[PDB]
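Retro notes, item 3 of 5
We never archived the inputs for the retinal complex last cycle. Fixing that now. Sequence and ligand:
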Amino acid sequence: SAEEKHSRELEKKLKEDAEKDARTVKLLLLGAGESGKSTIVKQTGIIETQFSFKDLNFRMFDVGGQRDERRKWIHCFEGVTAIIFCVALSDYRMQESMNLFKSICNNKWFTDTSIILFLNKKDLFEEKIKKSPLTDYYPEYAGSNTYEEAGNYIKVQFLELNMASDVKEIYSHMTCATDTQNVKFVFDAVTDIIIKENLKDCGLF
Amino acid sequence: LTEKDKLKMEVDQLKKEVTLERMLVSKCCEEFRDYVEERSGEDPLVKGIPEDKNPFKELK
Amino acid sequence: MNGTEGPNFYVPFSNKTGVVRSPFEAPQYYLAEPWQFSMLAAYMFLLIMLGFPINFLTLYVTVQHKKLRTPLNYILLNLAVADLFMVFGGFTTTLYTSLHGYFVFGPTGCNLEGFFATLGGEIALWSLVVLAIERYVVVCKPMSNFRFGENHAIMGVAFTWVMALACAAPPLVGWSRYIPEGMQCSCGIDYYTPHEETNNESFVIYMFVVHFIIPLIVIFFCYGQLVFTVKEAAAQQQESATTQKAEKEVTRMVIIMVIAFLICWLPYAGVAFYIFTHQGSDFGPIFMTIPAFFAKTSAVYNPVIYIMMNKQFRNCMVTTLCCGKN
Amino acid sequence: QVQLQESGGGLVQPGGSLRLSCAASGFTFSNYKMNWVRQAPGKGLQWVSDISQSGASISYTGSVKGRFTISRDDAKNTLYLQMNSLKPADTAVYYCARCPAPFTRDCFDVTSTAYAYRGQGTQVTVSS
Amino acid sequence: LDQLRQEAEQLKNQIRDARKACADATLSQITNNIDPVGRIQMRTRRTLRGHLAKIYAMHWGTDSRLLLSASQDGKLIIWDSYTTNKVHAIPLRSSWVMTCAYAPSGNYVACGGLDNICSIYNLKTREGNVRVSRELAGHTGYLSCCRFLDDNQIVTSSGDTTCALWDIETGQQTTTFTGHTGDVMSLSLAPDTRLFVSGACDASAKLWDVREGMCRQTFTGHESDINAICFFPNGNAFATGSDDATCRLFDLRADQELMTYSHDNIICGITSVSFSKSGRLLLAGYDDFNCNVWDALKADRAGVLAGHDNRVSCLGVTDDGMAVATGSWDSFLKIWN
Ligand SMILES: *C/C=C(C)/C=C/C=C(C)/C=C/C1=C(C)CCCC1(C)C
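Structure as it came back at the time:
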């Protein structure tokens, strides 16, 4: 029949378009607005950026145009590979990014996905605490003033409230704004996440 | 003017929401019940379709 | 030397004392002891009562669940139905004739029995081989622009079925025999007789080339590349406390699977290689049946390794049994 | 509506305890996860306490580990927080928020601005 | 400020006392002399496949034959629900959708998602020219429900708390229905096509009207967010379908509840509600793959439609009541009868 052959041609077209998007790896980055997004996407709906590196194709989903409350649209990303935080390094928004990290590490839709965290804007941060330490808004928490341990102090604050009862490891990278190996780190991380699920997909883990 | 509008639009519209005359829920409930009972004799999803009038017959 | 031959049987006891008979006519108490027959029957009974539920409840938990019907678990279900064939065809009739003694089931019935037993064992072997193949190709990624879908799973299952039908069928058309082997209580594919009519030596070297060393080379290459590409990725990121949890477990599982293959398909190749090399030997009945012992143990220990240590099947089985959570 | 009124916030020299409470009215106060959020004088909102339904799961923030306690009195329909040995770095306002979905551990927008399920709270100022 | 909020809560308690004064008996106090419906058991007829991701919304055609579906792959597929053909399969720009609609003239197709754009496709126009006719920009925040009230006017929900109206001839947003505090999740146009009620995420539905633009009434009485409402086909009532497992049937001109539909085994959320042809069966889609019916005259359930394993995201009945299409997150649409 004419309409039945049209339906079969449409089904062939849909199955042919299935294999193009069933092979890519999709990622999302929250970032809490102001961040070092504009370098790591360079290297008002859903700003989709699409890069590739060594036979892995990526599709970021920089959602920033939506409002602050996000309990109603966050379930459409249940099936993403790895969340990419973009926490800027400016002590006293710093606080609002930490409240968002609590929400995504407690709900059922993201308690099995990884988080590729990024400590960002180091060469601004190293001079921003060379004179004004972290021990003003907090108590004397660090104990010293450099960029290694104070950068590691922001890491241990974010890793303090992760549950991680499954494969939920959190990579981290104290990254600059003139970096050249930043996209290699997001490639080296996501291959490890792909290995862990394929080991889980075959079953032996 | 966006910070000077929504502070007061809510309270003036909520003040407007009380002047409208209500009805007894028994009376409007009887209206709903009479409308849903006059038309329930020929609802094709409550009575069921006797295997011939439906356009959703078996397909192989 | 090697024994005495009849029209369609070979018994490894020499007729110089004049006590040997046909396996289809008279009981073999001259050959072995009756308590050995009862022990083999008791082991076959233990085999069926332990291998029937562990191979049926996997189809139970994959017909109740949808997540198990995955495009790379059809091989595991094919292994399950392979051991179910080895239980229903294989174990029950050899249990009955080991209880009764002499193989009163007819040469046509023995040609059916050896066909079904060799069929189940070869679907088991080749399902292990092609699951090693798909695990290698989906984890190690030797071919870019590739994914694993439903088009490849049934193709691999059909490959196991056509290799098993290339194994078990040429005894039926005249390339070998289906004599009862070992304790004269199990129809075995012929691999030891000095028979010249049906070109037996060419079949023995064909089986040792195609059906033993090619799956051994394939399994070794696949699991070695798997362990190498997991350990090389675990060396890439040492701070991740889950990858070091992963590489130890997959190395342990690869070692367990390789030992599981080479503890049940090695004595067949060893006995066949010793008999083909030593042209003319002298063995016993109880020596000839322990590779069948080890290979028929595979029908009950292969789900213990392949789906009970799978982390997805075992959760559904312990929520179906509702007792004994880990 | 969903009314969440609070009481128990004044001035207190540091080290001194202070107990504040949220009376709830509008829903069934037995099957909603509950949060205690603070807001510094100038800074954004910051989540503090994360009390679950029964009382088993209890979380805390970074700057508070071993100085605040929380308890839901179900029969009196009231949430309770108490600050023991508080520090002068808390001159905040305090809201008590309800997580949106019942029978669920999700508390996703209890810290967001213009949120519909938290009261106006109290004021906690600290002397020296 | 303190004084205006004190005045607001004082008149809120006045509204609460005025609603106290009228509620003498609910629906289940006066319905107690009727016959019950009975346990119906309707099976599927067309298990309809063709999707590869989770789907979010659907809408029947006016002729009760053509179905529509939108999912997370870029598909805007229009089906024929008689022989399970695929009449059209539109590849749209944004892969992310949230809603879709079929025009009452049977000619256009609306869609939209969190691309903040409701787009109109000119279906069956020319030789395979299934193209986007207009895109309705000028709308911040994500979008959750587009609905035609004509072949030229749309009413679309918002993320920034509006329920705005659109004229497709120039693309300009004519009127905006501000007044909500949370984001609006669904709409349901009246058979009068002058009133429409909209539910949002602050436990409050609002009965707007098209011409004068003012919210005539705001209905409270819920606890959690309100996910998907549906209008009762006389012009006097509507069901709500909130997130606390409570479908509540509200009415007009009295503003209080008529009934609640919940018992203790219902745990998860509700995300799709549609009435029957007469309204005797309120079809409610749950989150535990257990989209059920509700006898919306005796407040008791009468059957389930368990044929899925994921979130039953959407459902819809025909205009003649002869079917119900339920679509879920498992890429399927089960059409029950
Ligand atoms: C009940 C008996 C079973 C399942 C065993 C059947 C035996 C085989 C599949 C053995 C085959 C082999 C030889 C005959 C010699 C060369 C090596 C093998 C494993 C291919």
